[PDB]
Amino acid sequence: KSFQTNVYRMSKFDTYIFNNLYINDYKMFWIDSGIAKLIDKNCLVSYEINSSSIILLKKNSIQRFSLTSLSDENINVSVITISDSFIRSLKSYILGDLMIRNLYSENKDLLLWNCEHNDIAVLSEVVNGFREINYSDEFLKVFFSGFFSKVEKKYNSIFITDDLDAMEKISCLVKSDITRNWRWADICGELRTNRMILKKELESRGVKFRELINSIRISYSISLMKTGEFKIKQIAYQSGFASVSYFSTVFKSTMNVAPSEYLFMLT
Ligand SMILES: Cc1cccc2cccc(/C=C/CC(=O)O)c12
């Protein structure tokens, strides 16, 4: 209930490409074997990852990156999405060393951690739905809080962001009424904050207002598909779009696949 997991297949030189992918909850992913090339267009860097490389994606970030297989054998990419309720049950473990956390920055939204075998084992059983070694809530809180702490320490940057951060307020507001016809005036009035102030959250992420709203609605539609909802026409309108055609165009530009192709990837 605290984790949502998926496994995707990559064949030889296959490439997943994401543009303006809004991260609605903390995510992490890794490959099970072989070598892959990760190109991060936000940080203008590229590097190779292996079966020990764990990639962390920060909540409320807007991602622009590609992942390419460099291996002959088929690669499985495992993606874990961590629920906000679980993340908040961690706020007592992290923040328990808080004024050392005050000296951190907040630029990095895509982090890399080279882990050992036991980390992969715990994370793999999470993706397996806890069907073999089940874990207690205490073990998982200690494991994940310790994991985030040492990755934050490595980059000297905040990963678990605070609840009163401006982009979190904007995101939670849009997600609480996804079909509302959002405009700048609605955000300013609900947050009682000047547009000169809120616009910094969009500029530092490289998005206009419509692309921000569109990106949140796309990640909303992805959560809907993950529940087993299969009717694309329903998903388009449930996510707040005005037409199936516009939803599919925005989805394709974000995910590089048509909505129906991703829905089948989830099975
Ligand atoms: C994040 C990621 C990383 C690497 C490979 C991937 C392959 C397919 C889909 C996704 C993301 C799917 C949306 C989500 O899970 O919220 C993916």
Domain assignments of the chain as residue spans, ordered by start: 1-160, 161-207, 208-267
* Separation between Cα atoms, residue 91 and residue 2, nearest integer Å: 15
Q: Does domain 1-160 bear CATH number 2.60.120.810?
A: yes
> Edge-to-edge strands of the sheet including 3-10?
3-10, 75-82, 27-31, 53-57, 110-114
Distance 190 CA to ligand 1 centre (A): 31
* Separation between Cα atoms, residue 105 and residue 75, nearest integer Å: 34
128, 76 contact by CB (below 8 A): no
Structure's resolution in angstroms: 2.0
* Separation between Cα atoms, residue 49 and residue 16, nearest integer Å: 14
Give CA angle at 266 (263, 267), nearest 5°. 100
Topology at the third CATH level for domain 208-267: Arc Repressor Mutant, subunit A (1.10.10)
174, 182 contact by CB (below 8 A): yes
218, 251 contact by CB (below 8 A): yes
CATH number for the domain whose boundaries are 161-207: 1.10.10.1310
Chain centroid to CA 237: how far? 23
Q: Which of 7, 8, 40, 74 to mutate to test the pocket of ligand 1 (most atoms within 8 A of CB)?
A: 8
Q: Tokens in use for 130?
A: 């806890």
* Separation between Cα atoms, residue 4 and residue 27, nearest integer Å: 9
* Pocket flag, ligand 1, residue 251 (CB < 6 Å): no
From residue 38, alpha-carbon distances to 9, 41, 96, 111 in Å are: 16, 10, 33, 12
- 1-160 against 208-267: fold identical: no
**Residue 23 neighbours by CB under 8 Å, 6+ apart:** 57, 58, 59, 60, 61, 62, 63, 109, 219
**Structure determination method:** X-ray
Q: Which of 3, 40, 77, 217 to mutate to test the pocket of ligand 1 (most atoms within 8 A of CB)?
A: 77
Burial environment of residue 35 by CB neighbours within 10 A (0 to 12, 13 to 18, 19 or more)? middle
Distance 149 CA to ligand 1 centre (A): 24
Q: Tokens in use for 102?
A: 């005050």
**Residue 90 neighbours by CB under 8 Å, 6+ apart:** 141, 144, 145, 148, 160
* Pocket flag, ligand 1, residue 29 (CB < 6 Å): yes
Provide φ and ψ at 39, rounded to 5°. Answer: -110, 110
Q: Which amino acid is at 175?
A: K
Q: Which of 3, 4, 5, 6 to mutate to test the pocket of ligand 1 (most atoms within 8 A of CB)?
A: 6
* Pocket flag, ligand 1, residue 77 (CB < 6 Å): yes
Length of the chain: 267
* Separation between Cα atoms, residue 4 and residue 29, nearest integer Å: 12
Give the number of other CB atoms < 10 A from CB of residue 117: 9
* Separation between Cα atoms, residue 126 and residue 134, nearest integer Å: 9
110, 41 contact by CB (below 8 A): no
**Residue 121 neighbours by CB under 8 Å, 6+ apart:** none
- 201-219 exposure pattern, b = at least 16 Cβ within 10 A, e = fewer: bbeebebeeebbbbbbbbb
* Separation between Cα atoms, residue 248 and residue 250, nearest integer Å: 6
Q: Over 106-161, what HEC string results?
A: CCCCEEEEECCHHHHHHHHHHHCCCCCCCCCHHHHHHHHHHHHHHHHHHHCECCCC
